[PDB]
Amino acid sequence: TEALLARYRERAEAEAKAVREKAMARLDEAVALVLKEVLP
């Protein structure tokens, strides 16, 4: 049976979309932190 495989791949793409959406929230904050740390 491959129904569990289809469920697993749907879960994988859903988790990828969710993690991308979560990362989109603090993208500018991470950029600002990187610029602050790198600059002397």
Partner 1 sequence: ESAGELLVATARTQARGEVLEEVRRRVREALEALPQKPEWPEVVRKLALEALEALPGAKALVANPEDLPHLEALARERGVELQAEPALRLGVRAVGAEGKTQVENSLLARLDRAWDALSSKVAQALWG
Supply the minimum distance, in Å, between the C-beta of residue 25 and partner 1.
Answer: 8
- Counting residues that bind partner 1 (by CB under 8 A) gives 26
Binding of residue 3 to partner 1 (CB under 8 A): no
Question: Is residue 22 close enough to count as binding partner 1 by CB under 8 A?
Answer: yes
Distance CA 33, CA 35 (A): 5
For the chain, report the end-to-end CA distance as a whole number of angstroms.
Answer: 58
Which contacts (CB < 8 Å, 24+ apart) does range 12-16 have?
A: none
Q: Which residues bind partner 1 (CB under 8 A)?
A: 4-5, 7-9, 11-13, 15-16, 19-20, 22-23, 26-27, 29-31, 33-35, 37-40
